[PDB]
Amino acid sequence: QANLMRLKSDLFNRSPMYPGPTKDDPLTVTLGFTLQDIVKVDSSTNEVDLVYYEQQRWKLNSLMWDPNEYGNITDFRTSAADIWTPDITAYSSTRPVQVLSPQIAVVTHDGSVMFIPAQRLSFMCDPTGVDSEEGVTCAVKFGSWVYSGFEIDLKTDTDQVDLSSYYASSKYEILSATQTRQVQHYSCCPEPYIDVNLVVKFRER
Amino acid sequence: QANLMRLKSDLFNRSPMYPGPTKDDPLTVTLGFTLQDIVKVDSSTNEVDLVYYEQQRWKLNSLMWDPNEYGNITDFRTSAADIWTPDITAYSSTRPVQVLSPQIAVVTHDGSVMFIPAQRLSFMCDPTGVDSEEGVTCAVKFGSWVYSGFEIDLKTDTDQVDLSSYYASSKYEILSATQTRQVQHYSCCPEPYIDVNLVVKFRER
Amino acid sequence: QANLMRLKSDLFNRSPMYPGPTKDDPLTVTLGFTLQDIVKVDSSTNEVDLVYYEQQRWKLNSLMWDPNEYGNITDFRTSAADIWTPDITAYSSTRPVQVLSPQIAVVTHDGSVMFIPAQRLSFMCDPTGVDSEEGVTCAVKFGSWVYSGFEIDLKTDTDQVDLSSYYASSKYEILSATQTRQVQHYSCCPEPYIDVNLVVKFRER
Amino acid sequence: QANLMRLKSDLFNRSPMYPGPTKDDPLTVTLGFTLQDIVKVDSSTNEVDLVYYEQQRWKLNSLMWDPNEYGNITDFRTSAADIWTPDITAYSSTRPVQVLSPQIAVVTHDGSVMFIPAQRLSFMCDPTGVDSEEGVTCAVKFGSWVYSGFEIDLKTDTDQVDLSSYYASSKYEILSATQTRQVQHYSCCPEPYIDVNLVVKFRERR
Amino acid sequence: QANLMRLKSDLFNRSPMYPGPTKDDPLTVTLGFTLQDIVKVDSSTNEVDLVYYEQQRWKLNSLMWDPNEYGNITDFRTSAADIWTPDITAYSSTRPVQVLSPQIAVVTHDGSVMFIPAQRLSFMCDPTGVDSEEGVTCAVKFGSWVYSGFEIDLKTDTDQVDLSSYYASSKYEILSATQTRQVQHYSCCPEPYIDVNLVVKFRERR
Numbered sequence A, B, C: 001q002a003n004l005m006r007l008k009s010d011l012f013n014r015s016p017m018y019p020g021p022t023k024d025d026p027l028t029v030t031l032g033f034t035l036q037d038i039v040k041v042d043s044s045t046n047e048v049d050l051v052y053y054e055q056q057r058w059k060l061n062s063l064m065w066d067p068n069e070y071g072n073i074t075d076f077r078t079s080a081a082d083i084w085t086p087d088i089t090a091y092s093s094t095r096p097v098q099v100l101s102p103q104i105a106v107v108t109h110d111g112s113v114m115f116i117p118a119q120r121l122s123f124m125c126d127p128t129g130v131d132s133e134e135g136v137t138c139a140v141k142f143g144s145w146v147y148s149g150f151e152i153d154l155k156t157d158t159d160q161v162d163l164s165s166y167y168a169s170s171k172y173e174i175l176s177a178t179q180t181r182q183v184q185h186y187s188c189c190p191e192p193y194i195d196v197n198l199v200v201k202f203r204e205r
Numbered sequence D, E: 001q002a003n004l005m006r007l008k009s010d011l012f013n014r015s016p017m018y019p020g021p022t023k024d025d026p027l028t029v030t031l032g033f034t035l036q037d038i039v040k041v042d043s044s045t046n047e048v049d050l051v052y053y054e055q056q057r058w059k060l061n062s063l064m065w066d067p068n069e070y071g072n073i074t075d076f077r078t079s080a081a082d083i084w085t086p087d088i089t090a091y092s093s094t095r096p097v098q099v100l101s102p103q104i105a106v107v108t109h110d111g112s113v114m115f116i117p118a119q120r121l122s123f124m125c126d127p128t129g130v131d132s133e134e135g136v137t138c139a140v141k142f143g144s145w146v147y148s149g150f151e152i153d154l155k156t157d158t159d160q161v162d163l164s165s166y167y168a169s170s171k172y173e174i175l176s177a178t179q180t181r182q183v184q185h186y187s188c189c190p191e192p193y194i195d196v197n198l199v200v201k202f203r204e205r206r
């Protein structure tokens, strides 16, 4: 307890909070999805609801420490309000995301942060044909809402979505699920934005 | 990091917050809409639900800085709670607006602020005839709830709503969409209020 | 800006907040309704939903100032959390009221305050007969929940509800709408409570 | 204004907040219900929705004052966040309670507090037979969730629920409504807990 | 009052908050469920809704005190925001948990804490066959979301879920209900996580 209280005090009480990334000190966030369930499709509004968790990983110099000065602590859990977190947003959602897990992240001595929020998302998707053998494909882009590619870049560790926790008695079975980095240009804005495109192909079980 | 922390400290910790516009120092807010989806119509209550994002832009002297005094920083991202934002309100909503994007704005060295909230809005609209070839037209006014034209004026850069992110497999297709400045007089109040009228004509796809 | 920051500082930072009205210093609140839409009726639960805005007006000595000492400022906008507001409550609601406008009031140099919240209210009302020529009548009382007539009195400027913003394509048309001061006694309590009774007569369009 | 600001400052800024009742300084809370409407029944989930207000009354020494030292003020209104309030909970609810009135209480010079929250409650109730002449009976217990009878006791002033504000055009009419003190033992916990059992008998209006 | 205000001040104002368990100072949380109602099943989405309360118990050195230094106070009630509480999470929920009881815990002089939140949970469950004599079985794992078995361990006092407060007029009857410790490995993570698996077998009332 004593060593950890001291470490947290030194990282969070002694400085102002990290103000986020800049063009001079950009940040790369690693994203990965673990898909748990396609809960419902609404064919009258073209909305689909997913439950998943989203692994987020980044690294800051201001969160480094030497374990020997703090009783060999290599990592700790902390409330996500104590730290900056990236503003990763689904681009075609139709409702506010519902949070299904505690807002707690893990910080490691090299300055890396891992944050794995579980979410339920409603997004735009036409499920016509879901009851056929071929199924339907739907897609949703995840990226920073406010930072361009000059401040936040994204990457994945793999292009395969993790399906090993997928609910075996779901109404829908997954035929494939990929997660892929893309670059986008928008009408509002001259600079490239980065996203990860989650593409899921599914049908009725 | 260091230069930005210093800049934010100088703009926000050294003064009281901007108390909003006055008759002596009025403010012009530029509005523009990007329509993403007409999600649903309810013909039994005459309510329609849109998903869009609303570009808001204004300029304050108290947010100016010289880039050379702060490591050539020309702009930064900041929480919308750190700054004043205009109280832009839909005049015929039937539910509280749901916020679909992070509450983060971008401030530029000339004192200009850009804020682009994504929203889902339920508003008053009769969808009878939506299943015909001619479609239906619906309209909603956006403006300040509490400031008259003597404190807040509005403008648009174009009268065409941006449709380039419109969901291609929506239940509804858009025939036209305009955004137009207007002046209104109300029973309660002797002074002109300004709004932007969003007029959307649509039908079943 | 400078004059207004100074005025707000002198009214709000230099004293404790107004603790509300007393028997020695009672307060009169003026109420008026502007009815926008009867959104739905539920004949299986006897609930009706209205959208309206409610004009509230009162006057305090502690909010007076001389305009000449503050750059000729005659009024200003301020967050409703910065000031006391009356606890006006619908007496037959079935859900929490939903707030559809920003919580911002206007204070004038004579000490008068105006606050105009837009609301959606579900309340108790039997809509049987709404589809006939004669229509139905429904009523809801608005008053302080906790202050009797010895601390808060109410009045209206007119007994006619403002119908000039009523949605022209509503499912329901308004035949009449009145707002009238009344005195009530309740089982819990020996002292008179004051309310304004909103009586609306309507039918299917 | 001046006298009241001064009184509130003396009661709330000069001390730490009341930490709640103890075995040495127990508290009696008086409860009473005023039933406004049975809004709906759901026979597919066995849930019923009531709208009521709940009168709560208790007394603390730390809220006493002499009226003569404060301009003859005998009582005042204050936000319920400024004071401790009892944690009265429905024991068979199926949704969070919805609050329909402002969170404001009235404190009197003898140290007594009155707080009357209006609420909408969904609770467990089988409405099968509601459309008959005999109706259905449903019941819900209200009590402290965390304090036993050694710290919080409950009482009623009357066993009759107040029906004088009952909505006359409700879908349901009330045949009877009682509010009655009871003592319960729970498996988790060695002390008796006190509740008030609200029993309502109703049917479809005819 | 005076002794308790003093005790609370000494435990909460004089130090920083407990930063949670570590590999060097791990923590064991005891869990137990009391099932009140299966409120609904949705066979079109495979979601089931339960109402229960979850008894949580743990022990910290930093919450110890000697009763003789504080007027023989052996325990007290305190807001759950004043203390650390474990981040126990259902692993197959489809909605945020709804809280049905006040967020108040009880701390005892030996440093032990008891916290008993009542909750409504929607979780993944196929109710096909619920209308038969054999019924359906459904399961949900409860565990820390962020702490592995090296920081938080779990146990139960019994493997039988408490059914003595189960609503007698529910749409569903319970045939059996167990609560059992398990060890899991996940794709994200090399270290063991501990959970308690709540297994409930039920059918439509007949």
Ligand SMILES: NC(=O)c1ccc(-c2cc([C@H]3C[C@@H]4CC[C@H]3N4)cnc2F)nc1
Binding pocket: A144, A145, A146, A186, A188, A189, A193, B075, B104, B105, B106, B108, B114, B115, B116
């Ligand atoms: N260079 C600048 O001054 C500046 C100003 C504002 C923004 C911005 C951009 C976005 C949109 C870009 C992408 C598509 C829709 C939103 N996400 C959202 N919010 C913002 F504040 N970006 C850059």
Ligand SMILES: NC(=O)c1ccc(-c2cc([C@H]3C[C@@H]4CC[C@H]3N4)cnc2F)nc1
Binding pocket: B144, B145, B146, B186, B188, B189, B193, C053, C075, C104, C105, C106, C108, C114, C115, C116
């Ligand atoms: N001249 C004054 O002292 C004053 C006082 C109050 C208001 C005001 C006006 C409005 C309504 C005007 C428009 C239509 C409905 C609302 N938005 C809302 N909230 C307000 F506080 N405006 C000016």
Ligand SMILES: NC(=O)c1ccc(-c2cc([C@H]3C[C@@H]4CC[C@H]3N4)cnc2F)nc1
Binding pocket: C144, C145, C146, C186, C188, C189, C193, D075, D104, D105, D106, D108, D114, D115, D116
């Ligand atoms: N004389 C006193 O000490 C005192 C105490 C409490 C109240 C009070 C009254 C009400 C009810 C009056 C009206 C009908 C139902 C509620 N609204 C609600 N909340 C309250 F706190 N009024 C006066």
Ligand SMILES: NC(=O)c1ccc(-c2cc([C@H]3C[C@@H]4CC[C@H]3N4)cnc2F)nc1
Binding pocket: D144, D145, D146, D186, D188, D189, D190, D193, E075, E104, E105, E106, E108, E114, E115, E116
């Ligand atoms: N003597 C003690 O150490 C102790 C500890 C905890 C509790 C307690 C009891 C309850 C339950 C008792 C009743 C049935 C369910 C809940 N309401 C809830 N929350 C609590 F914190 N009571 C006593």
Ligand SMILES: NC(=O)c1ccc(-c2cc([C@H]3C[C@@H]4CC[C@H]3N4)cnc2F)nc1
Binding pocket: A075, A104, A105, A106, A114, A115, A116, E144, E145, E146, E186, E188, E189, E193
């Ligand atoms: N020491 C580390 O490198 C590390 C990093 C992150 C996490 C973590 C793990 C989890 C998942 C474990 C279990 C199954 C899915 C989630 N709950 C959630 N939130 C977290 F922050 N644990 C360990």
Ligand SMILES: *[C@@H]1O[C@H](CO)[C@@H](O)[C@H](O)[C@H]1NC(C)=O
Binding pocket: A071, A072
């Ligand atoms: C930390 O590491 C070193 C061994 O390299 C050891 O001397 C020390 O005692 C360890 N643990 C603590 C709690 O200090």
Ligand SMILES: *[C@@H]1O[C@H](CO)[C@@H](O)[C@H](O)[C@H]1NC(C)=O
Binding pocket: B071, B072
């Ligand atoms: C800032 O601008 C000057 C002038 O062009 C440049 O020479 C200097 O290297 C810049 N400093 C930075 C990017 O920190």
Ligand SMILES: *[C@@H]1O[C@H](CO)[C@@H](O)[C@H](O)[C@H]1NC(C)=O
Binding pocket: C071, C072
């Ligand atoms: C205030 O009023 C006087 C008299 O009309 C005028 O001369 C002065 O310019 C006004 N404005 C300010 C900011 O003092």
Ligand SMILES: *[C@@H]1O[C@H](CO)[C@@H](O)[C@H](O)[C@H]1NC(C)=O
Binding pocket: D070, D071, D072
């Ligand atoms: C309190 O009431 C008495 C009436 O008996 C009166 O004389 C006195 O003025 C009042 N006190 C104050 C401080 O107003």
Ligand SMILES: *[C@@H]1O[C@H](CO)[C@@H](O)[C@H](O)[C@H]1NC(C)=O
Binding pocket: E068, E070, E071, E072
């Ligand atoms: C605590 O209990 C003792 C008996 O052991 C009693 O005599 C004393 O009055 C109590 N109060 C204290 C120690 O403050």
